[PDB]
Design a protein around this ligand. Structure first.
Ligand code: ROC
Ligand code: CL
Lengths: 99, 99
């Protein structure tokens, strides 16, 4: 698909057996999901953005289906107001910015 | 151009006659620039991100070149860690996300 940016580039994802809405975010290093349980081990991390940092739990080798495209990678979980698909998974579905 | 996302999508911008580095950010509603002087009056705005909110100065109808493409629109100035080109100006340069 080609997505114009007049509005927020929101898509449906599947993660942990759950459907969620998420933002396709070229300005994010990481994939940050609102609080949910995920399988396997995790470790704590601090991630920063405008405003400062938040504490998250980092889970590795997590599969997410992103608007129909499967990708695997590290997902961090914590108190974000918006689920964001960052570059670590955007690369895996072949996403590019074009102008 | 076609910009992949293995690295941060950083480009050169020109604002106020000055060259700066900025991030092309589909996740950002607004364009946020590091402290600098800009002409005219400003109005207040609060912008929210991952760690919370920051106060910025909103300047309308600012001329800015982005990777060689001219945009004229709203920029907010404040204590951002990274200059961010958000959707308000990405649309003016005709940017799309594709996968
Ligand atoms: C810029 C503004 C207009 C305020 N918009 C936003 O911040 C919205 C807010 C939304 C609600 C909260 C959840 C995030 C979404 C998406 N974001 C956009 C989104 O693209 C945002 C833009 C950004 C990039 C760089 C630095 C700061 C801010 N990115 C991020 O928040 C990601 C989160 C992450 N760690 O992966 N940060 C970074 O990728 C990142 C990179 C370099 C940095 C250097 C110093 C300090 C912080 C740094 N953060
Ligand atoms: Cl990863």
């Amino acid at each position: 698909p080609q997505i114009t940016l007049w509005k927020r580039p929101l898509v449906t994802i599947k993660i942990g057996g759950q459907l969620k809405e998420a933002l396709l975010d070229t300005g994010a290093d990481d994939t940050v999901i609102e609080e949910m349980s995920l399988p396997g081990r995790w470790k704590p991390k601090m991630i920063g953005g405008i405003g400062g940092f938040i504490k998250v739990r980092q889970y590795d080798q997590i599969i997410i289906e992103i608007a129909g495209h499967k990708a695997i990678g590290t997902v961090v979980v914590g108190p974000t107001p918006v689920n964001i698909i960052g570059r670590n998974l955007l690369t895996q579905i072949g996403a590019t910015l074009n102008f």
